[PDB]
Design a protein around this ligand. Structure first.
Ligand SMILES: NC(=O)c1ccc[n+]([C@@H]2O[C@H](COP(=O)([O-])OP(=O)(O)OC[C@H]3O[C@@H](n4cnc5c(N)ncnc54)[C@H](OP(=O)(O)O)[C@@H]3O)[C@@H](O)[C@H]2O)c1
Ligand SMILES: NC(=O)c1ccc[n+]([C@@H]2O[C@H](COP(=O)([O-])OP(=O)(O)OC[C@H]3O[C@@H](n4cnc5c(N)ncnc54)[C@H](OP(=O)(O)O)[C@@H]3O)[C@@H](O)[C@H]2O)c1
Ligand SMILES: NC(=O)c1ccc[n+]([C@@H]2O[C@H](COP(=O)([O-])OP(=O)(O)OC[C@H]3O[C@@H](n4cnc5c(N)ncnc54)[C@H](OP(=O)(O)O)[C@@H]3O)[C@@H](O)[C@H]2O)c1
Ligand SMILES: NC(=O)c1ccc[n+]([C@@H]2O[C@H](COP(=O)([O-])OP(=O)(O)OC[C@H]3O[C@@H](n4cnc5c(N)ncnc54)[C@H](OP(=O)(O)O)[C@@H]3O)[C@@H](O)[C@H]2O)c1
Ligand SMILES: Nc1nc2ccc(SCc3ccc(C(=O)NCc4ccccc4)cc3)cc2s1
Ligand SMILES: Nc1nc2ccc(SCc3ccc(C(=O)NCc4ccccc4)cc3)cc2s1
Ligand SMILES: Nc1nc2ccc(SCc3ccc(C(=O)NCc4ccccc4)cc3)cc2s1
Lengths: 247, 248, 248, 248
């Protein structure tokens, strides 16, 4: 009788905070992961200790290929197998690295466009075909002021705005809402050094600090809740004003 | 200890639903009105029966004039006098009517640009000068880029209000004051507009071919003032059931 | 006969470059000015020496007041009195200065909202009521969504001007009048600004690390009024060397 | 030899043909890329070469996404250097367009709609820049934010193309390469379409109740590649007759 949600890339960082906060709200969860098997199993163990039979894991690579549609169908199917329903899809998984214009390029394309855009589209198709239903896409507040040399990443995130709009329009007559949450700087890349992390922190007007994963998850919670039942096609920036700051 | 909010144009329709919902969340509220004294007092009586001394009214005309700055200063002061603090400003009051390019024009300017943009700007200055979880929410319009025919001054005022939302979010972020917007599409239809004209609009909305209730607008305001939006500033949330996505 | 154009704020800087380029394209021009009478008369003299009876001046304050509608009416009338027709209006005049949230405030509203938005609206109404390739070009700002700190009234006026561009393109299309904007990033820096500060702005621009020339701004205006933009209405072209794409 | 050269993708018919012709009229030598329309492409190249010898060649390539697309896009750019010794302008015009309802395999639909609309432009942009008034013009869509029902993959590819236009403008600005877009609204309508359906679209356009000609779209491309646009990068000019301003 509890609703169920799929969260992609939910083993760590922002997807983990979203899975935790959905679980705290009453949801049963599918924790999708690609490589982070130990962290995924550890999170599902922690949620199941809190309410038994309320969490499963589901492994899949979201890189574009001719078998991506079957993998995305399987992610949705795993929610129905464990819980008998699927009320919420959160498209959180994402590849992120530079692709300068001046891995082979076709693998770069498959990974950055597949995880950020194609996989969300196919998960959206499988979600809708299997049916307060809603989908939330993790977008990027800086998509119009992009990082230098991130053209494929930026293309995938713009494509994800277009999917949020197109699917909100096409799925409205089934009662499925589709919206996005657009972080600015939240948890900084593990690879990143401390002086560089501070450099980004200092650009944020509201507090000169990055968003916690929980602050990002809070906006996801609102969008799936009964307090957003007339909201579809909207993207909420959660960026502390970063996107307002000129060069 | 209980936070306090000012809601402009709070006697009826969307501003009333926002004042009720804040009061329900535990805020003390200033109900601002221009011509609707009876309705504003009736709301205040209903809220003070629930919790004593938690709602006052405040009269002001928000037309642009040489006295609008004094009027905006008084609205904010009335919150500080009644409650000792002012944590939230909701700029909800709005004039709305057509102004064909082909009332004197300068009166139309004073109402459509004065209430919709200049009063928000002056209220924002007074709110910020007199300064927690402090935030301002501006009622924007989700159809600002696909405007109604012959509504140029209205459309100009609502675009100015987006500019104020972004500029004030940037400038007040250092003070811990967040500034955001909520942009309805079709909500409560204008009372005058015929019931056939209203049906035409409802049928265009993707989500449930109906208008937003006022309470659905109020729900987004409540989120943006809450501790769940503490990193959000300069954001405008559309609450339009998808209407702004629909091509001609 | 040659077509005719009004350019507001045309005595110096970008408005001068626009009047010169329209004149070199074959237009008769009304050179509007406020304070710069010597520079205005000097430019008309230069253009008249190149072709006689092709340039006049017209003085008007574009600050908002109860007489702004008459002054805007008179600017348009001056083009009809001089040249028998008015084909193009360029809304270039602009006040620009900080208005921190934390002159009287009502004077700042009247200047920054009057010159940047209300005057363009009233000149658009008079241009359309007095009515081939008719169009209006509004000088907008490429950085309206990443505003300079403490410039809220200026930013509000330039957002209102984007609103007017869209609303008037919509409403005047049935009459064959196109309405478009040109949005500079950094072009001619303010006269008062020191070289050190000008260089800080230059270094932000991806394309060439320099500001736009007045002539580069004028080239986009010339395109939008030309027969090469006959299907373009409601468009704002940024001429900013990529500045608006640069993150913090 | 001193004449510049341009690649136009999908140039055998319709918009891409009108862009190839106008570039050639301006003094460019042209590579006419095609996929299936060999007879039309050769017919165009022959007409252009009759006008001026040795100024047009054709180049065949499928721009669907695949492991060989990178090599194909490299060869299109290479064909311009082999034919003409230089490549000054890339116009990304080729486009697949058909509905992909959420409720041909889906992976073919992905390869065709995302490869032609977005990945091929990116690979062509990489190859163009690696081999270097240089500029790229991408054919975008004015109605991206108000999309046709059941066109999600087409709409995703055209949003990805906006992102490429902005990202590549920022990254290539240090090499002097400008990157811009032209966004038609409704231009030449599908061959198949009955006049009664074409009229439903025509009627929605404010400026003239008609679609843009291919020439009107080509005119905006000519402006962006010209010396009149030398400070413009990262901008998308809508050429849509006001269509995108019209609410449902
Ligand atoms: N963090 C920020 O500052 C920020 C800023 C703007 C936008 N965002 C957006 O917010 C979302 C969450 O951000 P984040 O920093 O938490 O993300 P992240 O840690 O960079 O990535 C999230 C997860 O995505 C999964 N992933 C990557 N490649 C994949 C593939 N090929 N197949 C399947 N899964 C794959 C990984 O799962 P495994 O670990 O299981 O391999 C990874 O843990 C992302 O969509 C991001 O673009 C974040
Ligand atoms: N209703 C919708 O569907 C919709 C759609 C888009 C945007 N919005 C926006 O949402 C907000 C609320 O909408 P609504 O329909 O509830 O608004 P509304 O009923 O049109 O007006 C709200 C209140 O504004 C006050 N007001 C009007 N002119 C004024 C003046 N010169 N001085 C002081 N107050 C004045 C009036 O208060 P008194 O009654 O006390 O005189 C009025 O009751 C507005 O900002 C509006 O622009 C609403
Ligand atoms: N310059 C830039 O880098 C830049 C950047 C972004 C946007 N823009 C926009 O591009 C346009 C041209 O820029 P600019 O730097 O050439 O403009 P500007 O020199 O700052 O102003 C142009 C003219 O505006 C007129 N003006 C000011 N207040 C007025 C009033 N109350 N009544 C009537 N006229 C008034 C003045 O005429 P008098 O001298 O006769 O008094 C002035 O010469 C402006 O709209 C500006 O906002 C410029
Ligand atoms: N027409 C409009 O109303 C309109 C509206 C909005 C945007 N646009 C945009 O404007 C541009 C031109 O419009 P249009 O109507 O002229 O285009 P179109 O006729 O639909 O297509 C242009 C050419 O694209 C090529 N193309 C299609 N699939 C391809 C593939 N898999 N590989 C390589 N080339 C392929 C085809 O070449 P072959 O014929 O040689 O196979 C076709 O002739 C397009 O980007 C379009 O999206 C047009
Ligand atoms: N999947 C993810 N998407 C995003 C998007 C934005 C951000 S924070 C902003 C930011 C952080 C790092 C850089 C940067 O230059 N990173 C280098 C880099 C390359 C590959 C992996 C990790 C970091 C640029 C912008 C973080 C993430 S995580
Ligand atoms: N009417 C006018 N509007 C504008 C708008 C922008 C610019 S250039 C950028 C700029 C110039 C001065 C300042 C400043 O702080 N004074 C900040 C930014 C110059 C002008 S002149
Ligand atoms: N490659 C191309 N991209 C586009 C984009 C828009 C248009 S005209 C608008 C339109 C025409 C036909 C349909 C249709 O449903 N078929 C929908 C919209 C035509 C084209 S052709």
């Amino acid at each position: 009788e509890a609703p169920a949600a799929v969260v992609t890339g939910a083993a760590k960082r922002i997807g983990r905070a979203i899975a935790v906060k959905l679980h705290q709200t009453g949801y049963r969860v599918v924790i999708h992961y690609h490589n982070s098997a130990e962290a995924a199993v550890s999170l599902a163990d922690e949620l199941n200790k809190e309410r038994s039979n309320t969490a499963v894991v589901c492994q899949a690579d979201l890189t574009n290929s001719n078998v991506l549609p079957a993998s995305c169908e399987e992610i949705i199917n795993s929610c129905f197998r464990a819980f008998g329903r699927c009320d919420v899809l959160v498209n959180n998984a994402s590849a992120f690295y530079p692709t300068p214009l001046v891995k082979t390029v076709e693998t770069q394309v498959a990974e950055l466009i597949g995880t950020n855009a194609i996989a969300p589209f196919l998960l959206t198709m499988s979600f809708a075909q299997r049916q307060n239903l809603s989908i939330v896409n993790l977008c990027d507040a800086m998509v119009d002021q992009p990082c230098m040399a991130f053209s494929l990443y930026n293309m995938g995130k713009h494509a994800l705005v277009g999917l949020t709009q197109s699917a909100a329009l096409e799925l409205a007559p089934y009662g499925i809402r589709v919206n996005g949450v657009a972080p600015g700087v939240s948890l900084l890349p593990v690879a990143m050094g401390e002086e560089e992390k501070d450099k980004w922190r200092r650009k944020v007007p509201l507090g000169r600090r990055e968003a916690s994963a929980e602050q990002i998850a809070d906006a996801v919670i609102f969008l799936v809740s009964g307090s957003a039942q007339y909201i579809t096609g909207s993207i909420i920036k959660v960026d502390g004003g970063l996107s307002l700051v000129h060069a």
